[PDB]
From a paper:
[name] ([name]) binds acetylated lysine residues on the N-terminal tails of histones through two bromodomains (BD1 and [name]) to regulate gene transcription. Here, we report 3′,4′,7,8-tetrahydroxyflavone (henceforth referred to as 3478), a natural product that exists in the heartwood of Acacia burkittii and Acacia acuminata, as a new inhibitor of [name] with a novel chemical scaffold.
Remarkably, 3478 was ∼100-fold selective for [name]-[name] (IC50=204 nM) than [name]-BD1 (IC50=17.9 µM). To better understand the mechanism of different affinity activities of 3478 to [name]-BD1 and [name], we performed X-ray structures of 3478 in complex with [name]-BD1 and [name]-[name] which were determined at resolution of 1.30 Å and 1.73 Å, respectively. 3478 binds very similarly to [name]-BD1 and [name]-[name] in the binding pocket. In both structures, the carbonyl group of 3478 forms strong H-bonds with an asparagine residue ([name]-BD1: N140, [name]-[name]: N433), and a water molecule near the tyrosine residue ([name]-BD1: Y97, [name]-[name]: Y390). 7-hydroxy of 3478 forms a third H-bond with the main chain carbonyl group of a proline residue ([name]-BD1: P82, [name]-[name]: P375). These three H-bonds fix the 2,3‐dihydro‐1‐benzopyran‐4‐one ring tightly in the binding pocket. In contrast, its density is well defined in [name]-3478 structure, suggesting a fixed conformation and stronger interactions in [name]-[name]. 3478 forms one additional H-bond with the water molecule near N433, and likely establishes hydrophobic interaction with His437, as NH of His437 points to two carbon atoms in its phenyl ring. The crystal structures suggest that the selectivity is mainly due to one extra hydrogen bond and the hydrophobic interaction between Histidine 437 of [name] and phenyl group of 3478.
Author numbering: 353 to 457
Amino acid sequence: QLKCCSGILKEMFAKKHAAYAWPFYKPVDVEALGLHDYCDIIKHPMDMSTIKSKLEAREYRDAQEFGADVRLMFSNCYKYNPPDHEVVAMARKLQDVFEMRFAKM
Ligand SMILES: O=c1cc(-c2ccc(O)c(O)c2)oc2c(O)c(O)ccc12
């Protein structure tokens, strides 16, 4: 399962999806973007590079704990932004990729 989790990350990082996945590669840079309310709204920030480091450090007991951090990442985007924001559309497109792969394991 955890080997299947590494492949899920490889797909989400792949060039085919980079046009909408790139905001989720790294932690939201609140200081550079002026998002000084982000920490008040988002209790648990999460991104793909942090997920990758947690995976390699064996911080996930199983694929469901891995999947929870991926979905936390999307849920943070859906919570913080207005629904018509372009970043929300990008999160949904990347969630499409993740959910189709996660379903196959
Ligand atoms: O949910 C997000 C929201 C935003 C964002 C940026 C500038 C604004 O003026 C704004 O209203 C929202 O930026 C992000 C980002 O840069 C990421 O890498 C990942 C997620 C987000």
